[PDB]
Amino acid sequence: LIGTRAKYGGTLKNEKGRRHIVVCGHITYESVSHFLKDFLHEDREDVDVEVVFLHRKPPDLELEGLFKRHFTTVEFFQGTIMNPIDLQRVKVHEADACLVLANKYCQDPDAEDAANIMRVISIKNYSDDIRVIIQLMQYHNKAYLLNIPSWDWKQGDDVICLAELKLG
Amino acid sequence: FIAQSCLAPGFSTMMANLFAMRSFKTSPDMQSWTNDYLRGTGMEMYTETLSPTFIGIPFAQATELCFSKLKLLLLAIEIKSKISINPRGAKIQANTQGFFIAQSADEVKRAWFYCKAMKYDSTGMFHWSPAKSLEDCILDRNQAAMTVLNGHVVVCLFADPDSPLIGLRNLVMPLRASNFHYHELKHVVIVGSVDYIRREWKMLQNLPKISVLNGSPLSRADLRAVNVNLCDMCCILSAKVPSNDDPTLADKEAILASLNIKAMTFDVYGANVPMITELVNDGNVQFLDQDDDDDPDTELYLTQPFACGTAFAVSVLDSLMSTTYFNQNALTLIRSLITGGATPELELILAEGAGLRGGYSTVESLSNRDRCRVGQISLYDGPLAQFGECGKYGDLFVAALKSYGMLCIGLYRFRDTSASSKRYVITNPPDDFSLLPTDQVFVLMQFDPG
Amino acid sequence: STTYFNQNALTLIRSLITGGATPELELILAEGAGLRGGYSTVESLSNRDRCRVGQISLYDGPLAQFGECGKYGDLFVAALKSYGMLCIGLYRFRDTSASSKRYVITNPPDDFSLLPTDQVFVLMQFDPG
Ligand SMILES: [Ca+2]
Ligand SMILES: [Ca+2]
Ligand SMILES: [Mg+2]
């Protein structure tokens, strides 16, 4: 009943002239390790961009060690993107962009796409002027995101359709 | 409540707040429109025996005196066995039970101490039709585009063929009451799967002016076919079972449909389309609106979408259990005001299993058509426009009652007086309240033959 | 990661693999009526002139002289000036001797040695007629 103290929580500390992004969705050891390797590569020109991860379930021991090795550039927070309180903690309004990862190996592509679409609505509800990049499983779900009044492709909003690119 | 909102937008919010027991403290300084809205939320139904001083006077003079003197709104009385809503030319008899709207039961006691010192059905309350077939009511994309649909009602239904039945009568029949003439009846079009509506067509055979369009209301092609930009009210109803995977994902279907319509452009934009949305979870109301602050712990009736008559949920109906026990007549007034006057043995007719059966109209039967109905008016034009500029609410209440017999219940004005066409509900403003030319008044309209 | 650092990078990918997907095509498709046709005009027919992804062979043709011993840089220069083709890479047999398996070489150096059985990834222009 006493248990242990909340390992991950609180509000991200603000810094002057600091650029950060929010990554949500499928936060597992496969996605985080692969994303961090490509995001932080020596070939790409180095830019001071902070990476903030938001997820509901606490990370396992393997993911915690990965975050430790990237202590000065990667942070993790416990919470859901559907909660406006949790959105304030990670400071989405000050984030350069929000990245929504998707579970490619999912039993129901419709269920995965519907959950990811709801995440964009929650982010756009908090503030419309946020760049959102989302991975999409099926092409017919792209119409729902385009019909959102706050969705603007000219402002940087992008949809990465796995089915469209794979078959292309 | 959704059907009543079609006739008068924002009526569902006024109905829900009038049965939830809320204690209202006046505040020194806060947001102006919230302060007016919160004062209305402190109003609820109350019943009290009328004073003997009121004996022998008509109802119109009785309710006018209560508003001017006792600052109480009398809207219904009981004549004995039956309840009449704003009766015309009805005397106040001895020991009469009256229905009042007030902040608390203490204020209501002043009324007791006042002193000088085949066209219609068998019941004749709803219109009837000779059991039109479902196949004749099915329309295609080109069939619905070529026909004119102005001032109609669009019912966005999300239901699987195996989904539990939600009783699509309860939304259509109140719109088919005998209070409305056949020329002023609002056309009803249902957008959804025909397989689900087929099971619902048993009790919709005899209701005139019903249209069924196959497809999904999410698609923009179906919405443009039925001309959603010209409809009086767009209703979003979901009948699918909740998967219980996540509370925030329960209303993903209705939220997407509401946002899709708000963004469409017509050759008039979709943001001005009046819509009402059904929510299975209270916490999903935060995604219905964009220009507002959201809080998980806030109460549903405190939210902006609910205050504007846009969002609705069954959680606000739990207060009816306590209200019914303390007074059986309170629930009877509820049903007669929202169901279009559903007489008792009419449910006995419905319980038989043969559906709605019609009857031949007689002089005795046609007398039931004369009763008050829920309506909304505007002060921009007409003979009541003089009070819009600077006239007080009390002056409008007396003038409307004396001239046309209409009983003003509340007001429906824009949230911002200056940008956005959002209107919130004020229930029973004080007699000294100031009006605006862009105000809409909830009134109880008498039946005018012809 | 590529999309976040540059939005134009994703736009190039979509145009290169989908044959050209203009933004308002997505809006038309999102309506729900499917693909919609239109009457070709003088301006509408101008969109047909754009580069396409194709593959050529150095076995028999006007560019066959570089197959024997010509360098990759010479083939890239000659093809661009004469035909407008832009060489992207090579599609060469795994074994030079045997299986008919060809692997992909992306942007070989200008000093690379070509083979008569080599295929080149090129971007050919639209030729009317
Ligand atoms: Ca009260
Ligand atoms: Ca909101
Ligand atoms: Mg109230």
Curated annotation (Swiss-Prot), chain A:
Q: Which residues form the RCK N-terminal domain?
A: 18-160
Post-translational events: Phosphorylated. Phosphorylation may be mediated by both PKA and SRC kinases, which activate the channel activity. Phosphorylation by PKA is however unclear. Indeed, although modulation of channel activity requires Pka-C1, it does not interact with the whole PKA holoenzyme.
Q: How far does the signal peptide extend, from start to end residue?
A: none
Summary of the tissues where the protein is detected: Expressed in muscle cells, neurons of the CNS and PNS, mushroom bodies, a limited number of cells in embryonic and larval midgut and in epithelial-derived tracheal cells. During pupariation and embryogenesis, it is expressed in muscles many hours prior to the appearance of functional channels.
* Location(s) in or outside the cell: Membrane
Family classification: Belongs to the potassium channel family. Calcium-activated (TC 1.A.1.3) subfamily. Slo sub-subfamily.
Its domain description in UniProt is: The S4 segment, which is characterized by a series of positively charged amino acids at every third position, is part of the voltage-sensor. The pore-forming domain (also referred as P region) is imbedded into the membrane, and forms the selectivity filter of the pore. It contains the signature sequence of potassium channels that displays selectivity to potassium.
**Entry function:** Potassium channel activated by both membrane depolarization or increase in cytosolic Ca(2+) that mediates export of K(+). Its activation dampens the excitatory events that elevate the cytosolic Ca(2+) concentration and/or depolarize the cell membrane. It therefore contributes to repolarization of the membrane potential. Kinetics are determined by alternative splicing, phosphorylation status and its combination interaction with Slob and 14-3-3-zeta. While the interaction with Slob1 alone increases its activity, its interaction with both Slob1 and 14-3-3-zeta decreases its activity.
Subunit structure of this chain's protein: Homotetramer; which constitutes the calcium-activated potassium channel. Interacts with Slip1. Interacts with Slob, and, indirectly with 14-3-3-zeta via its interaction with Slob. Interacts with Pka-C1 and Src kinases, which can bind simultaneously to it.
Name-wise, this protein is Calcium-activated potassium channel slowpoke
- List the source organism: Drosophila melanogaster
- Gene name on record? slo
Shown residues within the full chain: 346 to 506 of 1200
Curated annotation (Swiss-Prot), chain B:
Q: Which organism is it from?
A: Drosophila melanogaster (Fruit fly)
Oligomeric state and interaction partners are given as: Homotetramer; which constitutes the calcium-activated potassium channel. Interacts with Slip1. Interacts with Slob, and, indirectly with 14-3-3-zeta via its interaction with Slob. Interacts with Pka-C1 and Src kinases, which can bind simultaneously to it.
Q: Family assignment?
A: Belongs to the potassium channel family. Calcium-activated (TC 1.A.1.3) subfamily. Slo sub-subfamily.
Its gene is slo
User: What biological function has been recorded for the protein in this entry?
Assistant: Potassium channel activated by both membrane depolarization or increase in cytosolic Ca(2+) that mediates export of K(+). Its activation dampens the excitatory events that elevate the cytosolic Ca(2+) concentration and/or depolarize the cell membrane. It therefore contributes to repolarization of the membrane potential. Kinetics are determined by alternative splicing, phosphorylation status and its combination interaction with Slob and 14-3-3-zeta. While the interaction with Slob1 alone increases its activity, its interaction with both Slob1 and 14-3-3-zeta decreases its activity.
Q: Where is this region: Segment S8?
A: 57-77
**Which residues does the annotated region (Segment S10) include?**
306-326
The protein's superkingdom reads: Eukaryota
- Protein name per its UniProtKB record: Calcium-activated potassium channel slowpoke
Every RCK N-terminal domain range: 150-267
Q: What is known of its domains?
A: The S4 segment, which is characterized by a series of positively charged amino acids at every third position, is part of the voltage-sensor. The pore-forming domain (also referred as P region) is imbedded into the membrane, and forms the selectivity filter of the pore. It contains the signature sequence of potassium channels that displays selectivity to potassium.
